[PDB]
RNA sequence: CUUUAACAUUAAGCCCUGAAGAAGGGCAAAAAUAAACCAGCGUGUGGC
């Protein structure tokens, strides 16, 4: 139903989020950079700047909300999969034209070929913990 | 896909002496060699 520019649009802001979170620089210009000097032929601009936009208004938000659900954990905490749970709680917070099941569908695939072999366990628990609390209707 | 993965470690000898896995050697193979502290010789002169 959707083209792969949305997935790649998704990937590099999974992508330009981690490394704005590692690298921890402004906003604005490592965004400008990643697209006047990345591929982005392929990557929706819109997409992009409302998930980078929402995740930078609400990295207070969805650290209030992983903070609940840090404590089972044998290790401690990444980055990865910080980065991915951010993501794919922004879209299932206030996103209207990517459904429900396909946001959760393409958290899975990310959380499965970025984070880690045993990590995607962990993001689809708190995933099915976190989605039906801010989205009861299941948008 | 519902709440962090991982048990690894496969190589260096043979023989003799020795109470031993305490120690002493040879051989098949080789990179590389401050301090306290006892105490002549060659010229001249002259002499005999």
Redesign the pocket.
Request: hydrophobic share 35%; glycine share 8%; charged share 30%.
């Given at each position: 139903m959707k083209p792969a520019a949305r997935r790649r649009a998704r990937e590099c802001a999974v992508q330009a989020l981690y490394s704005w979170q590692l690298s921890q620089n402004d906003i604005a210009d490592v965004e400008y950079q990643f697209l006047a000097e990345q591929d982005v032929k392929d990557v929706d601009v819109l997409y992009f700047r409302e998930l980078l936009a929402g995740v930078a208004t609400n990295t207070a938000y969805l650290d209030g909300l992983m903070k609940?659900?840090?404590?089972?954990?044998?290790?401690?905490?990444?980055?990865?999969?910080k980065a991915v749970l951010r993501i794919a709680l922004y879209e299932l917070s206030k996103r209207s034209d990517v459904p429900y099941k396909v946001a959760?569908?393409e958290a899975?695939?990310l959380a499965?070929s970025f984070?880690?072999?045993?990590?995607?366990?962990?993001?689809?628990?708190?995933?099915?913990?976190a989605a039906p609390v801010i989205r009861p209707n299941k948008k």
């Open positions: 609940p659900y840090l404590s089972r954990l044998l290790e401690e905490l990444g980055q990865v999969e959760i569908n899975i695939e499965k984070g880690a072999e045993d990590s995607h366990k962990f993001v689809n628990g708190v995933l099915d913990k």
